[PDB]
Paper text:
Bromodomains (BRDs) are protein interaction modules that specifically recognize ε-N-lysine acetylation motifs, a key event in the reading process of epigenetic marks. The 61 BRDs in the human genome cluster into eight families based on structure/sequence similarity. Despite large sequence variations, all BRD modules share a conserved fold that comprises a left-handed bundle of four α helices (αZ, αA, αB, αC), linked by loop regions of variable length (ZA and BC loops), which line the Kac binding site and determine binding specificity. The four helices form a deep cavity that is extended by the two loop regions (ZA and BC loops), creating a largely hydrophobic Kac binding pocket.
BRDs are evolutionarily conserved and present in diverse nuclear proteins comprising HATs (GCN5, [name]), ATP-dependent chromatin-remodeling complexes (BAZ1B), helicases (SMARCA), methyltransferases (MLL, ASH1L), transcriptional coactivators (TRIM/TIF1, TAFs) transcriptional mediators (TAF1), nuclear-scaffolding proteins (PB1), and the BET family (Muller et al., 2011). The nuclear body protein SP140 as well as the related protein LOC93349 and [name] showed nonspecific binding to most peptides.
Numbering used by the authors: 725 to 831
Write the structure that this text describes.
């Protein structure tokens, strides 16, 4: 019945439990990232996604995927190519795509 939330909740949990999710668990802090909030204008992280999900913001699959996609693209825009974050972004992205295909949110 409440099917979309349950599906989105399962995917976000899997993504947050993945061994490469750790750079993305919290908002980037100004202190640790020179000039992030000048270059990345729509920041996103998995804690904020968890909140939005709880707050019933994800009324469409499109809104959820756009937010999760933003986590990865923000990462790749800012971090160096062979940095551990960039490697994490693409591994987690690959896992994201695998799971949203398995749930038929893309098909
Ligand atoms: Cl609830």
């Amino acid at each position: 019945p409440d099917q979309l939330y349950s599906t989105l909740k399962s995917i976000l949990q899997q993504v947050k439990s993945h061994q490469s999710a750790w750079p993305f668990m919290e908002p980037v802090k100004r202190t640790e990232a020179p000039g992030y909030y000048e270059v990345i204008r729509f920041p996103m992280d998995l804690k904020t996604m968890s909140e939005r999900l709880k707050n019933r913001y994800y009324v469409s699959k499109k809104l959820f995927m756009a937010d999760l996609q933003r986590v990865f693209t923000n990462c790749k825009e800012y971090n160096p190519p062979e940095s551990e974050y960039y490697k994490c972004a693409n591994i987690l992205e690959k896992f994201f795509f695998s799971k949203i295909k398995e749930a038929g949110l893309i098909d």
